[PDB]
Amino acid sequence: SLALSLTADQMVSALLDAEPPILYSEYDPTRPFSEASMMGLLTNLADRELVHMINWAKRVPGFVDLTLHDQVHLLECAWLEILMIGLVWRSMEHPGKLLFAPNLLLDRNQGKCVEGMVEIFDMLLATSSRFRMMNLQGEEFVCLKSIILLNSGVYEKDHIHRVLDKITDTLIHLMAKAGLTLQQQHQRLAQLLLILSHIRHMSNKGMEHLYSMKCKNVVPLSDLLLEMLDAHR
């Protein structure tokens, strides 16, 4: 594995370079928001984002060294988490709003159009506020997102934790470089990692919500999305 020999600067560069694009939604502004249409927009966006996510994960240092079954397992567990932390990050400077896509900006009241969704919106919006108050940096976000990928399904595995330690080394390097004292560094590291607990909680909720919408037959789910959902069921 050549991921263990990366300096923290190189780790950051690789992660930044591997970043997926910000996809647009198939939003038609003229079309009045129904539950089915809104859910259609969200799941269709997710579907196109998964493909970029797959190719992104392969460029996360260490992920390639894993076997195919393990690569599958990690993405199956963490995909909604990764979608969500991306959304939260994109929505940082849009208070009271979630930027699912540049053309799909939704506030709380619109989440009400889909039953059970607004509670998820509130949690996402609060995560976005948290990142904003912390002034989350781009370099930190990509470290966090990669952590999610390797951490969420980990419970060989020793290699996974070696890379995870590497990313912690990276986060700390970022913080030291921004001028934080040692105390501030470990404190910020903790604040950032404790966010991952709530992202997990949200994903668990969204996964259940997604499963209910499938059984509701409201939105046609893509075959890939239908398989990513059976991983948790």
Binding site: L68, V72, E227
Partner: peptide, 9 residues
Amino acid sequence: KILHRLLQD
């Protein structure tokens, strides 16, 4: 699975 294909290809 589909995920397996994309990861492999």
